């Protein structure tokens, strides 16, 4: 990789060629984008980070992480972000939906699970898959999966001149981590895994624990808001779910679930039911966003929807010109090859029955007896990984950071990953998804000590 300056730091940029298919070593080729912020002091190596998703840009994440990086880390490490194969600035980039395709889905309330509703959703799904194949070809899609990003990560390690990898992964970046740990355990100098994915989980039970996580975060958000003057969910947090629904339900036509009655916004779209749910979910990733959820709900009281719409736009990555980045398309293409899809209708139907009970804030109306299959049930290329316990006996001690009321990656999944990896579990008491290098000096101190001196937190460490 030959480096060159960028388009906000002392940043350098470059690309790295990797083979699309590691079994056809000089067939089709992909170019991974990389960003590098040079160390200011005595350089141990490169700190490579990944923000998760999947589909989220590691380059953009390095730019954010740069501002909140502790001084000692910035001294001792080159901070490095990369865009995984198929993501953001990497070529070729996964593209399925036009900007108009995405807007058209988001205008639908998406709550009709009658047989006609399910059939409509599954038709939309088939057309999406068709568009992915038409724009990407089956070969590239076959190989965007995590098992191949781990291989790219080793090529990135070498390209950067590091003997052993120093790695921080958030969320899905955790799955990149444990996959790299299994294929290249002798190249791991150090590894922090914040907001963990347990690679051994059943797909459906993990989704239901995730639904429970968001419902618990909602409960926490509502209890907090209940102490505050003018709470749009009312002063009784046991009635918050009902009050929430009195606010979002009218966004759907009560006699015909397929008809949206969007809340008025200054934007021409207005706020559909589905965007109201998505904006709420976005807000529950962090208490930093609870003020916005409160504003957006206050707006709904007046039949207005601007803040919830901007919250959903943040989640979907739609900028102010109506253009989407590719994170949405990429997320799906990657998830669909990372494990066997659930194709059994009865399991999907029963998952829906339970989720309505576990997370009623997310659920509209009553169980109908039907539910749609996920996009992955229709994917034309097969899974290139499968659930299993992480086994990497020779691996250096690692740190798994896990937040007690993390909605997206529940506490217990971090515990289980730490067990499998036989590394240290660092606990953060809070209701947010991830926490490393995001303000908290106690967490950042443990992580700094581990990154430089190799020192792990003691058993039962809390922050």
From Swiss-Prot:
Protease activity is inhibited by serine protease inhibitors but not by cysteine protease inhibitors. Keywords: Cell membrane, Disulfide bond, Hydrolase, Lipoprotein, Membrane, Palmitate, Signal, Virulence. Disulfide bonds join 6-13, 96-132, 225-231, 336-376, 442-463. Pfam families: Abhydrolase_1. The keyword Disulfide bond applies. Changing residue 171 to A: Cannot complement the growth defect of the disruption mutant. Cannot cleave GroEL2. Is unable to hydrolyze azocasein. InterPro entries: AB_hydrolase_1, AB_hydrolase_fold, Serine_prot/Carboxylest_S33. It is a lipid-anchor. The active site is at residues 171, 406, 433. Residues 45-440 form the AB hydrolase-1 domain. GO terms for molecular function: carboxylesterase activity. GO terms for biological process: post-translational protein modification. It is found in: Cell envelope; Cell membrane. Its EC number is 3.4.21.-. GO terms for cellular component: cell envelope; cytosol; extracellular region; plasma membrane. Serine protease that promotes tuberculosis (TB) pathogenesis by promoting the processing and the extracellular release of the M.tuberculosis (Mtb) heat-shock protein GroEL2. Hip1-dependent cleavage of multimeric GroEL2 results in release of cleaved monomeric GroEL2 into the extracellular milieu. Conversion of multimeric GroEL2 into monomeric GroEL2 is likely to be a mechanism for regulating GroEL2 functions during Mtb pathogenesis. Key immunomodulatory virulence factor, which promotes survival in host macrophages and modulates host immune responses. Impacts host innate immune responses by preventing robust macrophage activation. Dampens macrophage pro-inflammatory responses by limiting toll-like receptor 2 (TLR2) activation. It also dampens TLR2-independent activation of the inflammasome and limits secretion of interleukin-18 (IL-18). May act by masking cell surface interactions between TLR2 agonists on Mtb and TLR2 on macrophages. In addition, impacts host adaptive immune responses. Hip1 is an attractive target for developing immunomodulatory therapeutics against Mtb. Belongs to the peptidase S33 family. The active site region is accessed through a large opening that suggests that the enzyme has endopeptidase activity rather than exopeptidase activity. Interacts with GroEL2. This is Serine protease Hip1. The lineage of its organism: Bacteria, Bacillati, Actinomycetota, Actinomycetes, Mycobacteriales.
């Amino acid at each position: 990789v030959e480096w060159t300056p960028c388009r906000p730091g002392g940043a350098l940029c470059g690309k790295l060629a990797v083979p699309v298919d590691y079994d056809r070593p000089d067939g089709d080729v992909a170019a991974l984008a990389l960003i590098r912020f040079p160390a200011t002091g005595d350089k141990i190596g490169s700190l490579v980070i990944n923000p998760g998703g999947p589909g989220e840009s590691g380059i953009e994440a390095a730019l954010g992480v740069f501002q909140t990086l502790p001084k000692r880390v910035h001294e001792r490490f080159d901070l490095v972000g990369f865009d995984p194969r198929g993501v953001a600035s990497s070529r070729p980039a996964i593209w399925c939906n036009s900007d108009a395709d995405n807007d058209r889905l988001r205008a639908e309330p998406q709550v009709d699970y009658s047989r006609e509703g399910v059939a409509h959703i599954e038709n939309e799904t088939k057309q999406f898959v068709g568009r992915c194949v038409d724009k990407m070809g089956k070969n590239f899609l076959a190989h965007v999966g995590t098992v191949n990003v781990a291989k790219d990560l080793d090529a990135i390690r070498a390209a950067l001149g590091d003997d052993k990898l120093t790695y921080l992964g958030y969320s899905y970046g955790t799955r990149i981590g444990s996959a790299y740990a299994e294929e290249f355990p002798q190249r791991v100098r150090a590894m922090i895994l914040d907001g963990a994915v347990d690679p051994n989980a059943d797909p459906i039970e993990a989704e239901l624990r995730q639904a429970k996580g968001f419902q618990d975060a909602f409960n926490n958000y509502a209890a907090d808001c209940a102490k505050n003057a003018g709470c749009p969910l009312g002063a009784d947090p046991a009635k918050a779910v009902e009050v929430y629904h009195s606010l979002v339900d009218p966004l759907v036509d009560p006699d015909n679930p397929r008809i949206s009655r969007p809340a008025r916004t200054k934007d021409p779209r207005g706020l559909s039911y589905s965007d109201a749910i998505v904006g709420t979910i976005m807000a529950l990733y962090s208490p930093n966003l609870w003020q916005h959820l409160t504003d957006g709900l206050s707006e709904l009281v007046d039949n207005r929807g601007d803040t919830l719409l901007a919250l959903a736009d943040m989640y979907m990555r739609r900028d102010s010109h109506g253009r989407y980045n590719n994170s949405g398309d990429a997320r799906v293409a990657i998830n669909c090859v990372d494990q066997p899809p659930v194709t059994d209708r009865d399991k999907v139907i029963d998952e829906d029955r339970r989720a309505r009970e576990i997370a009623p804030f997310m659920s509209y109306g009553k169980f109908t007896g039907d539910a749609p299959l996920g996009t992955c049930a229709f994917w034309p290329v097969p899974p290139t990984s499968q659930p299993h316990a992480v086994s990497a006996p020779g691996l250096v001690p690692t740190v798994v950071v896990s937040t007690t009321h993390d909605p997206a990656a529940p506490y217990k999944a971090g515990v289980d990953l730490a067990n499998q990896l036989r590394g240290s579990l660092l606990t953060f008491d809070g209701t947010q998804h991830t926490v490393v290098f995001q303000g908290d000096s106690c967490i950042d101190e443990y992580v700094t000590a581990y990154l430089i001196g190799g020192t792990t937190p003691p058993s039962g460490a809390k922050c």
